[PDB]
């Protein structure tokens, strides 16, 4: 087969999609009796977002299979823009219910973006770039969180609120996407298979790849077509009834669930707590959170290039294993830190290790992997399932973890460690290496595993 290359059209399409959708997502997540009322209220509001992501994940297949991947990204853009306009109206008139609805729409945007962007870039790019540009959206998510907290702090230093600059900052990616992206090729796979347009898909592939002759890739796509013709519509339920997609389904579910059950958010808002354990100043903890963001982003770029070179499997293994060791060593660390002052430092280092590990294997990979594993017609439903598992896991952890932490203290991380080890074992005995392989080949591997 002829190796594809990165063109200006593909790099700009990737950039627009990832920037608008996934960077507004990454930036957004940072933005996302009376005592008892406060805990239930606060809990409800923070619960509206992952429930929103759940709903958005459910409506992925509809939008994708009608409007296309790009069209889905544009609806993701109206679901993104509407809360901002509701914020302008909030400037005019504001209620707590509008806050709830805003976090709901923002949630929907989050889910739809997180699912569709790797799908779009996955069907757009050639297999190698499918892996790299598959990682890219999470890179923009890390960027976004980074710039979010950095610019938030810089704002606070500059002024209480940055309203015109912030509104402009949220407007720019959506504006650039809405303006430029519609003029960029749709998924050639969507065009040739679902929309049944040979010419449009041909020209799309021409502009994307940079060469005139797309024939081999198109006939490959039609190989996928005739592979999915036996399957049919493949509703989520039918997906659950299919043995051919079964281990693939279990793979997606275990991957997403494990990812969110790895205790990421615990690390997220208890980071400052361990920094307090170290004795680090609030400005200095702000600095080391900035540093963790930098680590995440940098190691996410490294995660792009290494995802392409080493493969997805080995990186999943590395990430989950490093996070497992991070967890266990963390528990022993927290036990030892109350006894000895040398340890908590170690705990800091180990936390950094965790951030790295999860930045490599667990976070970026599973979505692109959902794209890689399944075929054209079964991909969006699989994204509904995997996305649902993702946001529901984030919800479950979200509400349940406070009680577990308050009750069991440091031991809570041991459960996450068990999850990490089980997951790692699963990846060892299940997950194939999808690097450089066409969807058909990976489907043949998985089909072989399912049949036997």
């Amino acid at each position, epitope marked *: 087969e002829k190796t594809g290359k990165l063109t200006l059209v593909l790099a700009l399409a990737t950039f627009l999609a990832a920037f608008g959708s996934s960077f507004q997502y990454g930036y957004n997540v940072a933005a996302v009796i009376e005592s008892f009322t406060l805990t239930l209220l606060w809990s409800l509001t923070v619960s509206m977002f992952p429930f929103g992501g759940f709903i958005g994940s459910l409506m992925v297949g509809f939008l994708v299979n009608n409007l296309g991947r790009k069209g889905a990204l544009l609806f993701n853009n109206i679901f993104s823009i509407l809360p901002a306009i509701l914020m302008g109206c909030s400037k005019i008139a504001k209620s707590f219910e509008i806050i709830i609805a805003s976090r709901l729409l923002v949630g929907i945007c989050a889910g739809i973006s997180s699912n569709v962007v790797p799908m779009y870039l996955g069907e757009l790019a050639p297999k190698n770039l499918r892996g790299a540009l598959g990682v890219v959206p999470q890179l923009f998510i890390t960027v976004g969180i980074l710039v979010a907290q950095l610019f938030g702090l810089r704002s606070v230093l500059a002024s209480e609120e940055g309203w015109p600059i912030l509104l402009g900052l949220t407007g720019v990616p959506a504006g650039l996407q809405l303006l430029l992206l519609p003029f960029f090729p749709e998924s050639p796979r969507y065009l040739l298979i679902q929309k049944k347009n040979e010419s449009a898909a041909e*020209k799309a592939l021409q*502009t994307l790849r940079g060469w*005139k002759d797309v*024939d081999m890739e198109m006939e490959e796509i039609r190989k996928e077509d005739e592979a999915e013709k036996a399957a049919g519509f493949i509703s989520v339920w039918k997906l659950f009834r299919m043995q051919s997609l079964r281990w693939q389904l279990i793979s997606t579910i275990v991957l997403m669930a494990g990812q969110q059950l790895s205790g990421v958010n615990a690390i997220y808002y208890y980071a400052d707590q361990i920094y307090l354990s170290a004795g680090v100043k609030s400005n200095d903890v702000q600095y080391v959170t900035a540093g963790t963001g930098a680590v995440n982003v940098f190691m996410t770029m490294v995660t792009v290039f290494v995802v392409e070179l080493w493969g997805r499997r080995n990186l999943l293994l590395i990430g989950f294993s490093t996070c497992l060791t991070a967890c266990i060593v963390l528990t022993v660390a927290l036990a030892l830190q109350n006894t000895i002052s040398w340890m908590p430092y170690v705990s800091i280092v180990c936390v950094i290790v965790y951030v790295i590990g999860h930045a490599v294997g667990p976070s970026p990979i599973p979505a692109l992997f959902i794209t890689e594993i399944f075929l054209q017609s079964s991909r969006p439903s699989a994204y509904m399932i995997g996305g649902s598992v993702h946001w529901l896991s984030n919800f479950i952890v979200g509400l349940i973890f406070p009680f577990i932490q308050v009750g069991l203290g440091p031991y809570s991380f041991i459960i996450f460690a068990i999850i990490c080890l089980l997951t790692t074992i699963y990846i060892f005995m299940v997950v194939p290496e999808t690097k450089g392989r066409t969807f058909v080949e990976i489907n043949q591997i998985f089909a072989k595993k399912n049949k036997v």
Partner: antibody
Framework: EVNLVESGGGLVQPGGSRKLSCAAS????????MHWVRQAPEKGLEWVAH????????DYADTVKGRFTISRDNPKNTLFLQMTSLRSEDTAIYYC????????????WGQGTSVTVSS | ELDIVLTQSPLSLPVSLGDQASISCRSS???????????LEWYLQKPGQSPKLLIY???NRFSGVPDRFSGSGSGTDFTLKISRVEAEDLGVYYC?????????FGGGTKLEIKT
């Protein structure tokens, strides 16, 4: 090394017919588009026809539309040009050329086969 | 009918070895392809030999083409430059566009040694 060797040429009367072939080796033939290019005696090069790797794309020079048919057989690693209703205008050396898809350009040429149309 | 025409100039270029030499190719309409690429190519043919690719995508040297060859141009105007003509460079140069069907060669430019 990469080789392209054309055959099937020779002397033919006006109104007559002739089928040219081009045998390819040293590369994966089915991954590359292919062209026919001609050159009349004491004349410049004249592009004749193109066929994509999978035969989905086929194009002809204006001077041959309706008269020439280009085809290819990828498993047999062979390019063909079936010519009919030949005229004096058509007397020329016929080159088959490789379409290199990273560049889209004719990077390899055969030695050519000579076709002569006359009494 | 849609005819993309390629014009080379001059038709004949007498040179001494070591000379700089430039060859022009003009298209009757823009030859930018729908793929965003511009497929203007230069080929060299020596007597009794088959043509060989020198330049592709306006300014890129093909594998094996010495750096004394350089291609340039924009839109409708294109140039092939030879910084120092060597004996092995003598022959007929053709420009070619592969952007718009039917594809077309220029009429050729003969690069020849002075006598």
């Amino acid at each position: 090394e990469v080789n392209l060797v054309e055959s099937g040429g020779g002397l033919v009367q006006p109104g007559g017919s002739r089928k040219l072939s081009c045998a390819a080796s040293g590369f994966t033939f089915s991954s590359f588009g292919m062209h026919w290019v001609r050159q009349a005696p004491e004349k410049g090069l004249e592009w004749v026809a193109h066929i994509s790797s999978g035969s989905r794309t086929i194009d002809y020079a204006d001077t041959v539309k309706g008269r020439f048919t280009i085809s290819r057989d990828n498993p047999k690693n062979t390019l063909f040009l079936q010519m009919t209703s030949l005229r004096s205008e058509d007397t020329a050396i016929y080159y088959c050329a490789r379409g290199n898809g990273y560049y889209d350009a004719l990077d390899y040429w055969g030695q050519g086969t000579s076709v002569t149309v006359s009494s | 009918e849609l005819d993309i025409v390629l014009t080379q100039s001059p038709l004949s270029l007498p040179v001494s070895l070591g000379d700089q030499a430039s060859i022009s190719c003009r298209s009757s309409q823009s030859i930018v392809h729908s793929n965003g690429n511009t497929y203007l190519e230069w080929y060299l043919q020596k007597p009794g030999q088959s043509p060989k690719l020198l330049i592709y995508k306006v300014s890129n040297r093909f594998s094996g083409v010495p750096d004394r060859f350089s291609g340039s141009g924009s839109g409708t105007d294109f140039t092939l430059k030879i910084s120092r003509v060597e004996a092995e460079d003598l022959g007929v140069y053709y420009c070619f566009q592969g952007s718009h069907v039917p594809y077309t060669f220029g009429g050729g430019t003969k690069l020849e040694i002075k006598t």
